[PDB]
A paper describes a structure:
ATP-sensitive potassium ([name]) channels are unique hetero-octameric complexes each composed of four inwardly rectifying Kir6 channel subunits and four sulfonylurea receptor ([name]) subunits belonging to the ATP binding cassette (ABC) transporter protein family. All sulfonylureas stimulate insulin secretion to reduce plasma glucose levels by inhibiting the activity of β-cell [name] channels.
To obtain a structure of [name] channels bound to GBC and ATP, channels comprising a rat Kir6.2 and FLAG-tagged hamster SUR1 (96% and 95% sequence identity to human sequences, respectively) were expressed in rat insulinoma INS-1 832/13 cells, affinity purified, and imaged in the presence of 1 mM ATP (no Mg2+) and 1 µM GBC. SUR1 is found in an ‘inward-facing’ conformation, with NBDs clearly separated and the vestibule formed by TMD1/TMD2 open towards the cytoplasm. We have previously reported the location of the ATP-binding site at the interface of the cytoplasmic N- and C-terminal domains from two adjacent subunits, giving four equivalent sites for the Kir6.2 tetramer. The α- phosphate of ATP is coordinated by the main-chain nitrogen of G334 and K185, while the β- and γ-phosphates are coordinated by side-chain nitrogens of K185 and R50, respectively. In the current reconstruction we find well defined, non-protein density within the TMDs of SUR1, with a size and shape which closely matches that of a GBC molecule. A primary anchor is composed of two arginine residues, R1246 and R1300, which coordinate each oxygen of the sulfonyl group.
Numbering used by the authors:
A (entry chain A), B (entry chain B): 32 to 352
C (entry chain E): 1000 to 1039, 1064 to 1272, 1277 to 1310
D (entry chain E): 6 to 272, 284 to 328, 354 to 403, 414 to 615
Write the structure that this text describes.
Amino acid sequence: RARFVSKKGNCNVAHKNIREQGRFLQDVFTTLVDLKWPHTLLIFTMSFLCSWLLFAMVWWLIAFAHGDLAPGEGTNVPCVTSIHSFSSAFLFSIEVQVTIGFGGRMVTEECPLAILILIVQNIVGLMINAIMLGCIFMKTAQAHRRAETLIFSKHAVITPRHGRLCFMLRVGDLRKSMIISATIHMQVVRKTTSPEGEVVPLHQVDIPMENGVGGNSIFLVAPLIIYHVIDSNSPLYDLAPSDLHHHQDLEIIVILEGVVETTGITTQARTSYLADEILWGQRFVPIVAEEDGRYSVDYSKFGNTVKVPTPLCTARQLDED
Amino acid sequence: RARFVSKKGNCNVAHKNIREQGRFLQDVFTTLVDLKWPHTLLIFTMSFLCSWLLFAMVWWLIAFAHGDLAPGEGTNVPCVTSIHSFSSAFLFSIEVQVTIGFGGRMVTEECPLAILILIVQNIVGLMINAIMLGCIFMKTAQAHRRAETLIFSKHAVITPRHGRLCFMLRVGDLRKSMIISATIHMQVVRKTTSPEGEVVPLHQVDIPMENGVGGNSIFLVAPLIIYHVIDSNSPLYDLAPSDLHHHQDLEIIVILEGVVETTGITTQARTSYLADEILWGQRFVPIVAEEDGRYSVDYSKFGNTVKVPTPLCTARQLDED
Amino acid sequence: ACTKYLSSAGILLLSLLVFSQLLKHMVLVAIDYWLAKWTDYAMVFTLLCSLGIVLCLVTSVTVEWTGLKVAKRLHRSLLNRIILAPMRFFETTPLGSILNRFSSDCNTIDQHIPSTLECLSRSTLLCVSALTVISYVTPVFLVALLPLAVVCYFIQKYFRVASRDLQQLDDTTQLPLVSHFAETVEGLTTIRAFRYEARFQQKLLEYTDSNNIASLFLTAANRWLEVCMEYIGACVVLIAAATSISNSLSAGLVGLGLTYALMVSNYLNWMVRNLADMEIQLG
Amino acid sequence: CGTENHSAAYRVDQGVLNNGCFVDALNVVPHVFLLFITFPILFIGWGSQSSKVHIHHSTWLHFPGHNLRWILTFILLFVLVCEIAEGILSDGVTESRHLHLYMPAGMAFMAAITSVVYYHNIETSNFPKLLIALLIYWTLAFITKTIKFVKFYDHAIGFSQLRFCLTGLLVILYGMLLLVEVNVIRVRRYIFFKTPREVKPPEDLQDLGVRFLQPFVNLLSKGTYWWMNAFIKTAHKKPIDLRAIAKLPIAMRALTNYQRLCVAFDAARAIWRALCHAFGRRLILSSTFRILADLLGFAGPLCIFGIVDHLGNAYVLAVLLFLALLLQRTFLQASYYVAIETGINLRGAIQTKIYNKIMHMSAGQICNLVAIDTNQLMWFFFLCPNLWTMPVQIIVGVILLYYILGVSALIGAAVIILLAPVQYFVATKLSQAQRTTLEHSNERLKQTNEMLRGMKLLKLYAWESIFCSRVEVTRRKEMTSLRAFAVYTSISIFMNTAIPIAAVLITFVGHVSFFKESDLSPSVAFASLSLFHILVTPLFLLSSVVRSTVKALVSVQKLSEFLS
Ligand SMILES: COc1ccc(Cl)cc1C(=O)NCCc1ccc(S(=O)(=O)NC(=O)NC2CCCCC2)cc1
Ligand SMILES: Nc1ncnc2c1ncn2[C@@H]1O[C@H](COP(=O)(O)OP(=O)(O)OP(=O)(O)O)[C@@H](O)[C@H]1O
Ligand SMILES: Nc1ncnc2c1ncn2[C@@H]1O[C@H](COP(=O)(O)OP(=O)(O)OP(=O)(O)O)[C@@H](O)[C@H]1O
């Protein structure tokens, strides 16, 4: 009785024997963006800290090689001014990569090497900031947060409309902003067997949206009733009004794609309906009311369904008679 | 026996007599992003180095024109303080573009020209950083790395399903993250001749996905079996069960498009199947198993196919009888 | 409830046993204590010889006498209680459920329970003595001792669960092998002329493998618990040595502490293993 | 680095001037660089294991020649801890602190653990474009300690220059382990055109789900059973079923072990030789680990002796004792876990062989043969390592006991010589009473079966009392046998408790009363005591080993009979 995907999508599938070739880590940036915020912050905190520290040791050493640190004498000229301890060297490293340049610690012309190190450190730190920014930008574009604003009624009903038995489901959007080119796809997950004896554990069947023009798009502003009319080509043509719910173990996958009008990022709203989450002989209660100046949506009535007289047979039997 | 595209896509086609108009280089930024990381780094290392250096020479010269460098006398006032050698001038250049400003080297009001040079150098260096960042961002968006995470079975089989002879192929995704609006296109590359005597060296034929709603989209979470039912309109209607594999030299092109849920970047997964990579009379072994709490995918069984009794004739002959 | 064994034992021999065990263990502690007060001539050495005579067999003889008492009492009691019961309780229940108890449980009680309870109690009082002496030498050792005791508690619980499961599963696993084996001998010519022996090769392979993976896990489990129990013993060796030398900076207290710090690694293993075994065998 | 202004007076004096404190800062470099370059990489892996690790339980491979990598890391950590001790001893002048004379080493220790967890993560998921940093780090650290060692030889005093010897030791350590990964380069050759490397048998072994995946893990697990940890939490959570339990790995087959046994046969002088030729290679490793565990056990009271010597060089002995105990325990477990595996595979292959002999017959005795003697083999094999090991522990304990105590070592030697054949004798009379108890138990249980099956007919006649009196008769005969058991068990536990008392008592007293030139320091006494705590186990295990080898001769004799 395992679900393919949860009520909130979040597909629950294990993947055994991945022959990892290391491609998992090669894709460093999709991974970084995929990370939770606390880890993105730790990595960049660590990267900066390490970069500042790794270079700082080099600066301290160059001071040491020159031997300028303990003489503290005027005649000798240091490569990096005001360098008395590692700590002084560390602070110098910080001032270089984050471009502070306090000035109490300056680079002289004594060490042609110090000049080279300065060039390298600036560039390395520079590239790090470039990469870090790129990563942060993509994270701020994680539109999946908008996917959480999309609503799917907990249960979908089966009722006749225009004399035809159909599958109904309510969907909505809580934000004022729109989702452009909102497209809905519906698949039926069913362990199926062909006549050739072939067995499929999770066969996915495409379900038409009864769109008037055969399209999959929908202008969703107010909660809408998405439905599928069951016909000779629908896998639900043989649904039993009583056993389909509990003894059969099927799952309806509802996918809502589209782009956020604000970012341009394509997202997905995923949900599922097990056999026991579907109601037979019930329909949805109207949600939209009307004020003198506008239309109003009552979201507390989303899961509100009522029992209506309905034929208690399979769609096939209904058509046969 | 040359392949159009490799098993891993990477289309292998030479392009002779390009009448290059220079548009190849005009598109500097698509090119920069296209470059491998080591070269992107070298270019920007070089660009900074050059920019820092080119300007540094100018700074040294302005010191020279003023003649402030060798007098080292107090009465005279330098345009740029602490300038004794080119090296001192170089370090000054660095401190300006990467905005360090150590302070040991400052710009005075003596040279109205030095002031102008400072303005120019800041802006030039500023624009460079802007362009450099832009380039780095697009590189961090190179979602082709996700294309490498997509799997295509090495060989595709030909077996009957529901009594109809069909072409089967397994496809998967190794990452937890999804690919939105995943669309599959299938083309047949065949040197073909019309009745008018016209000859085409690489004619591409469109192949339907047997989608229940006539769509090309697929919600791929678990490995799926993509197939094409051979009919009167399919170019495989006359396939010979034995000679189609070796004496005929056809190629099946499989394209998997879609956008990465994390970046919003559209990518492609490209693969091909030569005649000898197709099996006749074999099907795929089930991959998905089931644990008490979830569904499990065994990826080590991807290329696992078994022999099943099948008609040994062309799809046409099968239909004729 | 393990106390039913105690009620079948009688309180008097319990008192004899526990008082004699505490007697000989505190005698061992006192031997090492006056050894320390020695080493930091006739007097305390004659005291040590007089101490070392005191340790005696009485706990062992008390254990064995008590086991004989429990055996004859439970045997007579279950015999008379079952022959009191009507024929209907024999008819509803399987006779194998009675006779398997009669054979296995009596052989368990009369062969393995008494000695293993004695060694479990002995190892228990030995680790108590070791911790007591190490705490007596190094008083601030207890701060380090506490979370290690917590970790030993957690490991202890997890091991006991996994060990009961694997042990019972191994004991059930080995039996259809010898069952199939005896069958395969009894119908040998039948299978040969049937020419089905490849099938029963395969079945014996399945049974044999099963007995292996069952045994392997049991062995692996035992090793895992044993390995962890020693790491903690090595840690308390380190901490006791550091604290003792830090405070010393007398000799005898430190040397006793290190001796018992050595012994505690074997003590933990012995106690846990015997605990899980007795938790099985009191069923 | 120092007290006065000398840290600079290095470079104030001209040229290189051999750079005394400076080479320590050069050795800082490799270690600090390593941590920093790899922190970003290691961290993403750590975050990925927190995010999505269901894929991580699917993929496993070993780089070629990696066991020696593990053990070289272990012993270099050992010597690093030793040079940390040398650095603290050198700073023990304490006129001022000398950070650069022990901290560099400490950073190496930190670096070493990272340098091996990084290797564990590249071995976790194959990405050979990632140990480039690793090998350049090893060659750079090798170069820096090489410079340190040659300047040490430039300022040499020679043999007792302790840091010199230790330094060159870990120099050639890094050099040889550096050669290890270029052997890995020679294998995989990823910088030139190819790497076709993949394991099927652990990967296809993984197909059934739950695993006894020990044969393929890191050597850390192979000492500590790290893999087991994950498995037990489930058993605490949910109950355990046979389906949940694993299926043995590719090499672990009754078929495969039987096949190698058949190869051994194809190759007194027959079956025994085949068994050795089939399992000797596997067995001798357990023996070796057991021998090393013996040496590390004898290191214990030596450390006690030195500690109570200096308390009459202290924490260093404790730390070395700590490492010795860890490796000892681990070595003992390794020997234990290999003895077992050999036993098991022997049981499966021998059962298969017996079965095929039955299949070639062109019966309760045969069931007894399998159900007894194969189990005896399994057990004997576990205690097979001890056949020559027991002589070592006892003898080397005697040698150190003499080097501590002088003439009184023969007292405790007399105690243990009086110990062992007493155990043998009591085991003999135990087995006699076992056979008596088996006879009485068979009588009682068979009569009990007849009574329980006819218990209805006894209920018809109220004839239960007569046959319960029969039960009582056979039960009293059983109680006679059980009193014999009580006798023999009490005498065994009295031996195993009272022997360590008498040994210590008579040894110290005969020492001191034998000559008034005795000197009963705690360093003598307690080291001898802990030796006596060691040497109970070998004797008490050796008596059972002797009886086991008698039973072993019997098992081979009966199998020789049946395989005829
Ligand atoms: C543990 O005493 C000793 C003391 C000292 C010496 Cl030098 C050797 C031993 C010793 O024992 N050497 C045999 C090696 C050994 C025996 C038992 C155990 S164990 O922890 O009881 N685990 C199991 O027996 N598993 C069973 C074994 C039989 C098949 C089915 C699984 C672990 C290892
Ligand atoms: N070989 C080539 N490589 C790249 N671009 C080309 C090439 N040949 C033509 N083009 C550009 O693309 C167009 C292709 O059209 P076509 O080849 O018919 O040109 P055309 O009719 O020969 O006229 P033209 O002489 O301008 O090419 C041309 O107008 C030209 O601008
Ligand atoms: N278990 C797996 N996990 C990840 N990637 C895989 C896995 N198995 C195969 N691949 C990659 O994807 C492709 C899947 O094809 P398939 O499983 O048919 O491979 P194959 O025919 O067994 O050949 P190969 O032995 O190269 O896998 C393989 O070519 C392989 O490169």
